[PDB]
Symmetry: C3
Subunit: 282 residues, 3 copies
């Protein structure tokens, strides 16, 4: 097996091209870069610029006005243990009308791209979710933008259907994001022309095991890269609704160690009453 | 914003004084010291003394007789990874009649103070829990007394309604407990005359977002304080009943990333079948 | 109290011998070695040999063919953060017909031994699970074989009914597995003639508190044992069905900090929709 992280054009997949190769990617790797999906670098930079300005120059009062009273990183600003800004389809917290305009447009484009790629994952695998495709994809997305100051993130897999990641690079050129591919950790660099897609465990679940959910991590630099090692990432989790329903025996056939009585269950039955975005194997 | 941790007299709040200031504390900080609440330092020291004597001089058999067969720190003694002693309203494990007398009185005073302050949090925010105030406050408290030998605790927020903390100081004067206030970690020293209150996430939940649940941590000393760095803390979690019921849309409006189908849910639906006292943002 | 880890012969316990001593072990220690239970060292070595050969010499494609698409360590091979091989009663992933023959026989013998010892734990404590003994023991076992390359595992207790552990030793003689016994960590060495049994929290639960679930950990070597410090362990979790039902008040009497409304609950109500094999006190 080639252990290259492939690139697919969303437009081409939508036209029914590369289906064998897309299926094989999904099963053997569960990650790919995605071009031609409406996500430009120029827009990335307009949303990045305005949030970095807020992180840098927003006063404590401005920051407090867009901070939830529980520090869950669901909505608004989180001073972290890094700085984060989160949003979804509603209940958002925005610093200014300008920020709101730029981030609503950016979110919507990320949501559209994620739905579209998930629709292709389902089609390529012959999967019709219980309740139909479009109700499955009208869901509970979460977008988190994180600034990291000059492992940085422990290995895990995502529990999303898909996760779309747009990064900014380290000024020093260090590549921080890595995933398991072919039994080896492989670099996932920034590309101005593409978004990185990770498949998550709900893809594996809904397709009956036809999609891998790869583990990944964020590495820290060694000696030379203290200097020039800040980076940012825009992480869009496409997450199912609480009432997404699946087959319990089918889940057990593809590695889910469920403790569910009966023949069908929901996402809420499986994960509980709070969303869990990631899981460690360890 | 002043980033001072304020002090309120429970008696004054009960008389309807300082309401604007109490509301603003609750929303912007979610922590305060509480005087005039029936918790003396002299009593703290009588309960502390008898449990420290047990920790120090109790034999393994004495300790085993008050150790639960699962090491959950719910009741009785836990030799930890520190030493802890836990209690609640019933099912307690006591080393001797004297200890029982002193710790039952101490627990009861902590429970009374916690209920009283929670009642003021609810009143100041205009909150009537589903099922009424008094059923909400007749709940599932947990008291944990921890001795720490000469970060010591990772940052988290509490999932209680409120948490009351009485500490003993480091002989060397180091201040170990810190909380986020105004975007900076701030010292929370021992005060002989007051108990520290942290608001927890259930306060945020039940009030519809009018109360912050602050993050906090316990720091370790640097070079000078190896010597004189032991301390103790009495941590009283006021925790809701499993059947405490709340609005799902309201929860989503104030930062809770719930995965709950339908319009109302219980605490058990949200957190699951075992109590979870704390949560990390990370 | 003697703080020796005792040995019992399963055959003798089955004949009704040593009952007082077995009860006292279960309550005060919750761990023992088990002889005369159908688990030989020769068989251990035949299963170990064939899986170590696979770990060493299996190609990435061979490994991929027996890797689940979600990395849960439920079934098949997991390249870890060490290498693991997992199996249960069905849905297994086997590298070759020979491996399948040897590992099916090995699993079955481990399952038989675990059921048998659990049956004695129940009998010695006078326990009839809701729904009867044999339905309780026809359950959801998980076997995990781990190779460790030259703490290595944080302290926890198991959430199984019982856990059977067969190890291979460090070539250098270092003893890595340790458990709390009598308030001190005690060595649990490899024995060619016996399997180690840990009681888990479901034993404590189903018996109404008559069985301790001990904490344990895996230590790393110091200076001399870098060399000769690889080891393996075969860990068999005997885990209840999702619908195992118990008394909520009884659970609270023996240390379980449950958040369960009502008088009875299931294992799924308590732990949720995914199996959780271990728990930290910390
Ligand atoms: Fe991730
Ligand atoms: Fe806390
Ligand atoms: Fe264990």
């Amino acid at each position: 097996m080639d252990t290259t992280v492939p690139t697919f054009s969303l437009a081409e997949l939508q036209q029914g091209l590369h289906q064998d190769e897309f299926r094989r990617c999904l099963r053997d790797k569960g990650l790919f870069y995605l071009t031609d999906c409406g996500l430009t670098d120029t827009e990335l930079k307009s949303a990045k610029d305005l949030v970095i300005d807020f992180f840098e120059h927003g006063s404590e009062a401005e920051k407090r006005a867009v901070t939830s009273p529980v520090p869950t990183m669901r909505r608004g600003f989180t001073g972290l243990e890094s700085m984060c800004y989160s949003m979804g389809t509603a209940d958002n917290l925005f610093p200014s009308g300008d920020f709101e305009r730029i981030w609503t447009q950016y979110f919507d484009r990320q949501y559209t791209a994620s739905r579209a790629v998930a629709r292709e994952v389902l089609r390529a695998t012959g999967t019709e979710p219980d309740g139909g495709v479009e109700a499955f994809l009208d869901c509970e997305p979460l977008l988190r933008f994180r600034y990291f100051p000059q492992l940085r993130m422990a290995p895990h897999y995502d529990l999303s259907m898909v996760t779309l990641i747009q990064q900014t690079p380290c000024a020093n050129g260090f590549v921080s994001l890595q995933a398991e591919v072919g039994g080896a950790f492989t670099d996932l660099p920034y590309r101005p022309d593409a978004v990185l897609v990770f498949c998550g465990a709900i893809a594996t679940l809904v397709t009956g095991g036809q999609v891998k959910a790869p583990r990944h991590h964020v590495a820290a630099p060694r000696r030379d890269q203290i200097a020039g090692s800040s980076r940012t990432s825009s992480v869009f989790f496409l997450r199912p609704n609480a009432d997404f329903t699946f087959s319990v025996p089918l889940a057990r056939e593809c590695g889910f160690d469920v403790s569910l009585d009966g023949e069908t269950a929901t996402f809420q039955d499986w994960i509980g009453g709070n969303y869990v975005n990631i899981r460690r194997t360890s």
